[PDB]
Design an enzyme around this catalytic site. Structure first.
Site, PDB file in Angstrom:
ATOM      1  N   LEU A  71       0.776  -1.338   0.023  1.00 12.63           N
ATOM      2  CA  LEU A  71       0.053  -0.214  -0.013  1.00 12.63           C
ATOM      3  C   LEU A  71       0.862   1.262  -0.047  1.00 12.63           C
ATOM      4  CD1 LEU A  71      -2.784  -1.167   2.621  1.00 12.63           C
ATOM      5  CD2 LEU A  71      -2.971  -0.967   0.180  1.00 12.63           C
ATOM      6  N   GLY A  80       6.340   4.347   5.044  1.00 12.42           N
ATOM      7  CA  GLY A  80       6.682   5.686   5.860  1.00 12.42           C
ATOM      8  C   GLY A  80       8.097   5.640   6.018  1.00 12.42           C
ATOM      9  N   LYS A  81       8.652   6.468   6.781  1.00 14.42           N
ATOM     10  CA  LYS A  81      10.030   6.576   7.262  1.00 14.42           C
ATOM     11  C   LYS A  81      10.499   5.524   7.808  1.00 14.42           C
ATOM     12  CE  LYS A  81      13.190   8.917   6.684  1.00 14.42           C
ATOM     13  NZ  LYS A  81      14.188  10.072   6.314  1.00 14.42           N
ATOM     14  N   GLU A 100       6.535   0.107   6.303  1.00 23.80           N
ATOM     15  CA  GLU A 100       5.891  -0.361   4.990  1.00 23.80           C
ATOM     16  C   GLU A 100       4.549  -1.131   5.396  1.00 23.80           C
ATOM     17  OE1 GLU A 100       8.157  -2.072   2.113  1.00 23.80           O
ATOM     18  OE2 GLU A 100       9.783  -0.685   2.250  1.00 23.80           O
ATOM     19  N   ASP A 160      -0.650  13.517  14.615  1.00 27.97           N
ATOM     20  CA  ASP A 160      -0.349  13.147  12.999  1.00 27.97           C
ATOM     21  C   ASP A 160      -1.667  13.029  12.659  1.00 27.97           C
ATOM     22  OD1 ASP A 160       1.063  13.372  10.779  1.00 27.97           O
ATOM     23  OD2 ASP A 160       1.407  10.999  10.873  1.00 27.97           O
TER      24      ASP A 160
HETATM   25  O1  3NG Z   1      -0.234   2.815  10.050  1.00 27.76           O
HETATM   26  C1  3NG Z   1      -1.296   2.195  10.669  1.00 27.76           C
HETATM   27  O2  3NG Z   1      -1.773   2.194  11.898  1.00 27.76           O
HETATM   28  C2  3NG Z   1      -2.075   1.840   9.626  1.00 27.76           C
HETATM   29  C3  3NG Z   1      -3.553   1.182   9.785  1.00 27.76           C
HETATM   30  C4  3NG Z   1      -4.544   0.755   8.968  1.00 27.76           C
HETATM   31  C5  3NG Z   1      -4.065   0.962   7.597  1.00 27.76           C
HETATM   32  C6  3NG Z   1      -2.917   1.666   7.298  1.00 27.76           C
HETATM   33  C7  3NG Z   1      -2.018   2.293   8.242  1.00 27.76           C
HETATM   34  N1  3NG Z   1      -2.752   2.175   6.102  1.00 27.76           N
HETATM   35  C8  3NG Z   1      -3.507   1.807   4.998  1.00 27.76           C
HETATM   36  N2  3NG Z   1      -3.393   2.240   3.724  1.00 27.76           N
HETATM   37  C9  3NG Z   1      -2.276   3.181   3.276  1.00 27.76           C
HETATM   38  C10 3NG Z   1      -2.241   3.536   1.959  1.00 27.76           C
HETATM   39  C11 3NG Z   1      -1.205   4.251   1.319  1.00 27.76           C
HETATM   40  C12 3NG Z   1       0.009   4.294   1.756  1.00 27.76           C
HETATM   41  C13 3NG Z   1       0.073   3.816   3.132  1.00 27.76           C
HETATM   42 CL1  3NG Z   1       1.636   3.719   3.847  1.00 27.76          CL
HETATM   43  C14 3NG Z   1      -0.869   3.239   3.817  1.00 27.76           C
HETATM   44  C15 3NG Z   1      -4.739   1.172   5.182  1.00 27.76           C
HETATM   45  C16 3NG Z   1      -5.713   0.695   4.268  1.00 27.76           C
HETATM   46  C17 3NG Z   1      -6.556  -0.119   4.765  1.00 27.76           C
HETATM   47  N3  3NG Z   1      -7.159  -0.404   5.875  1.00 27.76           N
HETATM   48  C18 3NG Z   1      -6.091  -0.024   6.898  1.00 27.76           C
HETATM   49  C19 3NG Z   1      -4.896   0.687   6.728  1.00 27.76           C
END
Ligand code: 3NG
Length: 328
Positions: A40, A43-44, A47, A151
């Site tokens: 998806l 981050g720093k 991933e 954040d």
């Molecule tokens: O860090 C968490 O707590 C965290 C927790 C849940 C999600 C997430 C990050 N990032 C998502 N997506 C995403 C889309 C683009 C870039 C990045 Cl790094 C992440 C995502 C999508 C669907 N359901 C849950 C998540």
């Protein structure tokens, strides 16, 4: 020195183990339960992948933490444990590691998110009230648990617009609030940094999250996203001061004895405080109301201590249609 108006003592009144995240002992699941499907993003220090839990076929999200900043990892894990079951906080399903390399990963529920760039242009007036109310529930919950998110921004507010479901994600910058503690101001994304961060004032609190929330509210009702679009951290404060006013900025600095970086002297100019009605035009008029502008004015204020708390914001008349519908 400055103190939070609410929840200032919650951590000191709890057992030390509640906030002493460095002492936390992690319980590990089975890494082989999870199969990575698609990357998806990155981050720093992490991933993020879509994955499948092979024990129940359910889609999940796996966040692999690397660099293994051991202290930051325990902090995020303990904060998520303290927040378990909180309303609209992303659900942590599991914590696993590679048995050989020891690299840890967090496993979260999967939210079928609508990209905010597309979403924010088609929300109705009610939708904005509804989702802002749902976000406030998560912030009131975490602040009441003695935790600042630090954040808040559209990317970290995941909205399934089909099922009307919202989750506040990415607790990797979150921190426990302790009165009089000086915190690092290198938190939040540029566009959502509160003026306290931009002037290097370290004795901030939960009210930092309410500035970020106000930034999001402004972007939704006015359709300018991000609302304050600075080119760097210096220009970010200039963009704020062109709206809230420069004399008002200096009064805030004087109240808290804040020193202002002299580089600002040549870039701040002189600007009156602007009426929030100045941002209304034909394309956003249907989203703006006296109630919306009153709430926004009580959030986007320099004086962090005078901003509404999450609970006070939820009580504002702007949310009455949501409250009345959540009871019919
Ligand atoms: O860090 C968490 O707590 C965290 C927790 C849940 C999600 C997430 C990050 N990032 C998502 N997506 C995403 C889309 C683009 C870039 C990045 Cl790094 C992440 C995502 C999508 C669907 N359901 C849950 C998540």
């Amino acid at each position: 020195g400055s103190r939070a108006r609410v929840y200032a003592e919650v951590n000191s009144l709890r057992s030390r183990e509640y906030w002493d995240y460095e002492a936390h002992v992690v319980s590990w699941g089975n890494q082989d339960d999870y199969q990575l499907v698609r990357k998806l993003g990155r981050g720093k220090y992490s991933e993020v992948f879509e994955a499948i839990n092979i024990t129940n076929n359910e889609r999940v999200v796996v966040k692999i933490l690397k660099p293994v900043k051991k202290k930051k990892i325990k902090r995020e894990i303990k904060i998520l444990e303290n927040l378990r079951g909180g309303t609209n906080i992303i659900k942590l399903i599991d914590i696993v590691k590679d048995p050989v390399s020891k690299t840890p990963a967090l496993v979260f529920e999967y939210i079928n998110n609508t990209d905010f760039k597309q979403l924010y242009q088609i929300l109705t007036d009610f939708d904005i009230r509804f989702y802002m109310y749902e976000l406030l529930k998560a912030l009131d919950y975490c602040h009441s648990k003695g935790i600042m998110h630090r954040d808040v921004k559209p990317h970290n507010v995941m909205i399934d617009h089909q099922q009307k479901k919202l989750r506040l994600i990415d607790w990797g910058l979150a921190e426990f609030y302790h009165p009089a503690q000086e915190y690092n101001v290198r938190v939040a994304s540029r566009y959502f940094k509160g003026p306290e961060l931009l002037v290097d004032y370290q004795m901030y609190d939960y009210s930092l999250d309410m500035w970020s929330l106000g930034c999001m509210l402004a972007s939704m009702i006015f359709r300018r996203e991000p609302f304050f679009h600075g080119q760097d951290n210096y220009d970010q404060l200039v963009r704020i001061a062109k709206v809230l006013g420069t004399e008002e900025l200096y009064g805030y600095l004087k109240k808290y004895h804040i020193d202002l970086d002299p580089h600002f002297n040549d870039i701040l100019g002189q600007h009156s405080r602007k009426r929030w009605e100045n941002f209304i035009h034909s394309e956003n008029r249907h989203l703006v109301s006296p109630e919306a502008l009153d709430l926004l004015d009580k959030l986007l204020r320099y004086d962090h201590q005078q901003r509404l708390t999450a609970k006070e914001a939820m009580e504002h008349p702007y949310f009455y249609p949501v409250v009345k519908e959540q009871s019919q």
